[PDB]
Design a binder for this molecule. Structure first.
Ligand SMILES: NC(=O)C1=CN([C@@H]2O[C@H](COP(=O)(O)OP(=O)(O)OC[C@H]3O[C@@H](n4cnc5c(N)ncnc54)[C@H](OP(=O)(O)O)[C@@H]3O)[C@@H](O)[C@H]2O)C=CC1
Ligand SMILES: NC(=O)C1=CN([C@@H]2O[C@H](COP(=O)(O)OP(=O)(O)OC[C@H]3O[C@@H](n4cnc5c(N)ncnc54)[C@H](OP(=O)(O)O)[C@@H]3O)[C@@H](O)[C@H]2O)C=CC1
Ligand SMILES: C[N+](C)(CCO)CCCS(=O)(=O)O
Ligand SMILES: [Cl-]
Ligand SMILES: [Cl-]
Ligand SMILES: [Cl-]
Ligand SMILES: [Cl-]
Lengths: 312, 312
């Protein structure tokens, strides 16, 4: 079997060896312009259109959790991937734990008011502050998927009330599930820390704007771990300077890297990480990919399929 | 039984009431200057020497985990607490959870390099940084006690290699136990994050000095949650500037409130909070104090006693 691989930042050599080692029957190769020789599978991330264009592939594996990049290309260039070719993505593969680290650290940080204590420090002002109660510090997670579930589970253990928002009702003990645009307002109602783990789709783009930010309590927080398009950077800045939002932390942005122009860099109550929240562990990825290929060759059940109708 | 109470900031009326209702046969009163009447028990926190000096009591209950306020004064004023008067403190009473909150948030903060990332945000600079591995990010807890154990519990759960330092051997899961000054250098050797939860005694005053810091590995971190006297502040700053230490977070200091002319305030790699890490939960304190008093009256054994021979 032939396998092509493309990724603009990963070490192709490592993945080439790793996959061949996992699939002894296979011939894996790094793809690059001019490579129009046959292939059965493709492992990708930010692939050029000429790569998949008109190719007969049994499956395409996206090397991350998000598939918006490739789905937006497939929409502006429908000749890239034929609708018969199943698409896969990485579910967890170590990103679960990394999201739990980030979320638990930062939800605790705001709850203990370390953000204020750093403010007060920079002025050189010793000033104790009243504790927040747990009942007033609810955690709302938009996107209750593979990653949202891992996060909500790490926070539940700490006694914070938890709620989640998704398109389908979830029945997790110790968590309250809000569903669809009808319940979005309710979900935002008593949510203190807004955590975003939504996939970027035509249906979620820009969902965090002035309209959404008004439905949150004053002194609320925003932890954006999904994609930059989800938030209106000018509307975020305005909700902080007004007092609707106590603080925020962002790992993704409108444009990456973020240009120095951006006022986010200069605002003091905005923490920023350069799109590094969760990355796949290559060995766990190799395990999932090789197993799914084994199972696809045998016509047996598989996981991680992208439903292109829903768009994620 | 007559009980006297004193606390500088808590609401005396509330405690008097709670205690009389936890102990129906007690006549409880707030102590104030001029009160020379007899008492059987005293509940105190940072009490003036005149309150206990000379008194015949069945017991003194210190309203916190640390007893140095009292003890530190005994050399010069043995009169304050006749050697025959048993002294008690507050073991956990909800402080365990608060320490865990603090420690998990910040250890995770430094591990995910959230400190570099804010420095980077402050230089309008987009720079992903290398990930630290769990194996190089050992956590060392000096003072393996009521609170230190709680913190070890919460951190070993994240898979950080853990170690503790105390005067007796501890047997905890996922924790390496180090004991006495003979094993201190070994304890410090590969400790990346040093968390201090020691009690203030003559043996520990000044423990975190230039020489202890040299025994740490390079790029280490200091989390001081115990007493301000435990750290030689000037040596801390030297270690931070020479690179030995990457960062520090402090809740306690030489003088509290800390003078505005102290350079800790401006060192960008020194987070600080105004002695707010953990406080007792009144109902839990009342529960303990009342039950202990009842047991003492029946000639029954009790817990929470300060070993005046060891000094904590
Ligand atoms: N470093 C970083 O910043 C990283 C970011 N990510 C981001 O995390 C996202 C989440 O990944 P993962 O948890 O694996 O994905 P999942 O697909 O398993 O979860 C997505 C969740 O979003 C919900 N959802 C999708 N659209 C809507 C909508 N229109 N309204 C309400 N809910 C919606 C889904 O609902 P339902 O359950 O009902 O179908 C689902 O619960 C990725 O798509 C990616 O953008 C991922 C990894 C790293
Ligand atoms: N808000 C704040 O910043 C607060 C700070 N604290 C501080 O936390 C401290 C600890 O509280 P808690 O855990 O209840 O106290 P414990 O007395 O239960 O723990 C102290 C630990 O230190 C060890 N120890 C004492 N002396 C030495 C020494 N010379 N060498 C090595 N180890 C030593 C003891 O060893 P061993 O087990 O062998 O006896 C014990 O494990 C308090 O004294 C207080 O100062 C407490 C509450 C709040
Ligand atoms: C000098 N006194 C009155 C100061 C009390 O702080 C000692 C009182 C003796 S007793 O009543 O406690 O047995
Ligand atoms: Cl790689
Ligand atoms: Cl992703
Ligand atoms: Cl009170
Ligand atoms: Cl204390």
């Amino acid at each position: 079997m032939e396998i092509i691989f493309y990724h603009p930042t990963f070490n192709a050599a490592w993945w080439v060896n790793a996959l061949e080692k996992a699939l002894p029957h296979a011939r894996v190769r790094e793809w690059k312009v001019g490579d129009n020789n046959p292939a059965d599978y493709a492992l990708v991330w930010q692939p050029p259109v000429e790569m998949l264009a008109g190719r007969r592939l049994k499956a395409v594996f996206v090397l991350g959790a998000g598939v918006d990049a490739i789905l937006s290309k497939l929409n502006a260039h429908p000749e890239m991937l034929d609708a018969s070719i199943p698409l896969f993505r990485l579910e967890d593969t170590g990103m679960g734990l990394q999201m739990q680290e980030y979320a638990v650290s930062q939800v605790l940080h705001w709850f203990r008011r370390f953000d204020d204590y750093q403010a007060l420090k920079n002025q050189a002002l010793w000033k104790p502050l009243p504790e927040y109660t747990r009942e007033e510090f609810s955690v709302g997670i938009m996107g209750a998927g593979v990653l949202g579930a891992k996060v909500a589970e790490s926070l539940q253990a700490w006694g914070f009330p938890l709620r989640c928002w998704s398109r389908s009702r979830k029945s997790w003990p110790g968590v309250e599930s809000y569903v669809g645009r009808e319940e979005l307002r309710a979900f935002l109602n008593q949510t203190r820390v807004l955590i975003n783990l939504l996939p970027n789709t035509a249906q979620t783009v820009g969902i965090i704007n002035s309209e959404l930010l008004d439905q949150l309590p004053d002194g609320a927080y925003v932890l954006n771990l999904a994609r930059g398009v989800h938030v209106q950077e000018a509307d975020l800045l305005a909700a902080l300077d007004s007092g609707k939002l106590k603080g925020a932390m962002l790992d993704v942005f409108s444009q990456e890297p973020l240009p120095q122009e951006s006022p986010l860099w200069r605002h003091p109550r905005v923490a920023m990480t350069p799109h590094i929240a969760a990355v796949t562990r290559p060995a766990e990825a190799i395990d999932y990919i090789s197993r799914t290929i084994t199972q696809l060759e045998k016509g047996e059940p598989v996981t991680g399929q992208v439903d292109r109708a829903r768009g994620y």
